[PDB]
């Protein structure tokens, strides 16, 4: 079944029927540009009832000389490049002005309007340095930590947020604030780890598709979006800038001492790698669209630069694991008994994967070798592998995750990377790896990252985000990239020499 | 010695002692202050004669308010993240504005001054949107062809050049134009080839380190970099944007019929993989530095994606290969004699790498499937050793090159995709491709270019650039890398079942 969701990971955050009400969301028939949905905050923002708007066509509302460029663009298929649209809305005789942000999703033409006149606004000059020098900084970064600290310093400067951090996910979707720029007010989260549940699975998948979100104030009544009959099905809002956010995450931000936020998905190889997260500890922050997408852009630049700087690499060992491998291959090549030819290679075989223990099961007939004992316990380990898959190279940093019968062993302090030699799948190779104990600095108590109501099943976020030092056992140090090719390569060589052996009969 | 350099790889293009006169090059003593070199075109660009500039501090000519922010910047360690410098030059009592491009090379601090236009909100927004729309368009590129396509369209859109092409180097450092954006006006260079003497080694070694060069006009007068007594030794100008370029290359551009030029290096795996190259056919192109580097950054993103996007080339052919593989790995299951399992789907094994012939030598006997060399195919079956396989897949379209006897049968196998199955190297799988006449469109006879003066001992580039077809003989259609890959995966699949068979008997 693979994975494996929980109570958070089920909420449907993409169709709440409601938008954040500092702006107005509409959807327009194509090609009529007739309004089928409007949001009930329309009189507060545009000066019209919802009633008035529905079934009416957009051109009726717009000051007559900007009808042509707006309508032309709304039917353009190159629209995502055209945001923001200049929107002048005329009631009676007087004008108001909006950032129009149009998009299409699941066959709907959605248009959101952000009041753009009486504005926060940012001077062009710091908008100019943030994207021009921003670009220059990320390009000149010498390592990942310069890349990160350039991003947050630049986002903070351009937004004037109280806090801005780089948040990096891990293989289990825990996260960790690995860089930060802040005003002295806000408490520093630099160093903290957060549970994978602060950004649950449906959120995470959304932010892989939509890369930009802002909550300008966490205190608002949602504006319901009306529609006229024939469109009662809840409208998809994945890509709506104004979508109402999961109110329990509003609760979360409350307990985190933060009154506004903005985040930006960071992407590597197509999956979510981390966030740019920004916080205002007190005060709303209604950041104009233009400033946001400049922030999104520094995001997309930093993402694309990950590999070319996160690849500070490890430019040896690889070469020598290649050289260790050559050695093990040449020795196996030469004994008629190559299982005993690899077990005579205790140090070359342990050091290939940086394992501190190994075991070889073949025609019977286990031969342990390193220091990871089990032996009585290991016969249950090995053809537990024999059951439902251990193909190709099995690899884990916490064997007590997949086979918690290891909890009682030395644990994944006797740490496993394995495979089978023949696909008749009963000849195995194991590797074992000692513990890394590691103190880990958590925000609040991960044990209890979620609270429950009265007497009530509804969930709530933790009230405490203060440093809480867990110590972690089971886990050892990560199996690096180069360690699992080395394992498949040695698998490839066992297969070759076995095949050569039998060609010799 | 490797290369082996005809009559061009001498001319130290890095020390010409002259620049392109649309800008002014300066050299600055350090710590701070005082001008040791300066180009003679100062008065025409800048106001002052070099005689007045030389020996004096930079401040003396900088408008006083601008003076300290700028000399704080010229003292930074990483000037790169500050370019362009805002240089406000006060002459008489009028302020002329320049882009200050600063760097250090060989303990010498070099300030080039290019005339600047003062930025303004609206045209910056459109530029920023273009760079940002270019950046994502490359990330969303399906394959190399598309990556190349988006790149040339995006560079042209920013620079307004008449032609932007992707020039791709092959193995002898010849070239090919593999994609092009252009004003249909200009004659289309798409598909042409250009000999490696057009970009000599010390040019490419230069461009391996400096990824951006522009010649805003070919017809121009090298303003010489004059200096102070005690500084008269050649100035290393390898990283200067104004460094006057080798004058034989300007006649090349003249002869080629190009008035202005811009090129950007492309880097795969540390080595020069190609250029982005741009021309103006008549008229000039003084591209501002901000736009120039934004093009360079798209080049850096393109470099960063070459492997990934090329790895997804022919992404239907791959589907079709993988299901042919799948098909072959099953029909080898119902037969203990896997060899004839591959001889039933001889049409499948032949379509797997698009060959018209194949051969399996297994346990001393050879099975022939398509059109093959004569039954003396003991031919290249015995002959081999150094390279040859060793392992894994041997792949050529010039089998007459390495293995000369095949000239007799290039009508049926001028190309050879082959591997061995075991370390004993008695068993092989061979695929054949016939000769294909093939014609290669050069850019005027590439036998010349290695050209002399009167013929006095001077060098000179070709005169005609008309399509000059070469009819290459003795090759098959080139072997695609998804085909080489398909042979790799079959080869180890054949191993896996070669074991499993013998292994259990
Ligand atoms: C199971 C319920 C939840 C618990 C318990 C919890 O803690 N979060 C739950 C659900 C939830 N979270 C979000 C959105 C979200 N969460 C974060 C988390 C962090 N912000 C930070 O700054 C840090 C560390 C520095 C962490 C960790 C973030 C950034 C976001 C995105 C919104 C934002 O920027 O504030 C959602 C979805 C909200 C939505 O998209 O509607 C849910 C359901
Ligand atoms: C023996 C000397 C030379 C012969 C013969 C010749 O043909 N060129 C010689 C010297 C030379 N060229 C350059 C720089 C250079 N050349 C090119 C070539 C091309 N531009 C195109 O668009 C195409 C085809 C599509 C080709 C081929 C390019 C791109 C460059 C880079 C400069 C530019 O973009 O205009 C040099 C070095 C000059 C210098 O860097 O100072 C030399 C010595």
Residue numbers in the entry:
A (entry chain B), B (entry chain A): 11 to 515
Task: Give excerpts from the publication.
Phytochromes are red-light photoreceptors found in various plants and microorganisms. S. aurantiaca contains two previously uncharacterized bacteriophytochromes (BphPs) denoted SaBphP1 and SaBphP2, which may be responsible for the light-stimulated growth of multicellular fruiting bodies. The classical BphPs switch between a red absorbing state denoted Pr (λmax ≃ 700 nm) and a far-red absorbing state denoted Pfr (λmax ≃ 750 nm).
